Design a protein around this ligand. Structure first.
Ligand SMILES: *[C@@H]1O[C@H](CO)[C@@H](O)[C@H](O)[C@H]1NC(C)=O
Ligand SMILES: *[C@@H]1O[C@H](CO)[C@@H](O)[C@H](O)[C@H]1NC(C)=O
Lengths: 50, 50, 50
């Protein structure tokens, strides 16, 4: 599940950061798929009148 | 029956692939909704809690 | 992003490959059926393929 960690809870202490870091992360989102079309009669019968 | 199914394209493969994709995506849902922090914290002995 | 394109392409390839399937008929090419069997009893085969 991950490395174990514990934090020393106590009602008269506070832990505050003193330095920061500007990170940058990438998120990837699909938008649209390939606009496909299909010919019914051609695909089902080719070039036959029957 | 196994021979006679062979004349129907790849219906079985399509169905199996769809169901496998389903099975993958549920566990993906679980991992996404639950596992959001990678530091398993340890419960402190409850004494004060204000 | 690659998954969407891959899935669409694979689906289309499966759809195209489905044409090479006799579906229990004498042949998988309708032109062969037309050139081999006269209309009075070729309609059964045509209907199966359709
Ligand atoms: C919580 O604060 C009270 C102050 O009244 C103190 O007596 C108690 O020891 C504190 N709890 C700790 C330090 O765990
Ligand atoms: C804060 O972090 C930057 C990043 O390297 C460092 O240059 C700077 O000295 C740090 N300030 C501290 C630790 O007070």
């Amino acid at each position: 599940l991950g490395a174990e960690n514990s934090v020393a809870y106590s009602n008269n202490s506070i832990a505050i950061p003193t330095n920061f870091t500007i990170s940058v992360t990438t998120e990837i989102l699909p938008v649209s798929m390939t606009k496909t079309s299909v010919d019914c009669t051609m695909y089902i019968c080719g070039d036959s009148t029957e | 029956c196994s021979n006679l199914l062979l004349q129907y394209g790849s219906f079985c493969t399509q169905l199996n692939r769809a169901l496998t994709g389903i099975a993958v995506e549920q566990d993906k849902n679980t991992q996404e909704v639950f596992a959001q922090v990678k530091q398993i914290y340890k419960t402190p002995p409850i004494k004060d809690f204000g | 992003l690659q998954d969407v394109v891959n899935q669409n392409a694979q689906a289309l390839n499966t759809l195209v490959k489905q044409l090479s399937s006799n579906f229990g008929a004498i042949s998988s090419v309708l032109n062969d059926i037309l050139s081999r069997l006269d209309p009075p009893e070729a309609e059964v085969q045509i209907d199966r393929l359709i």
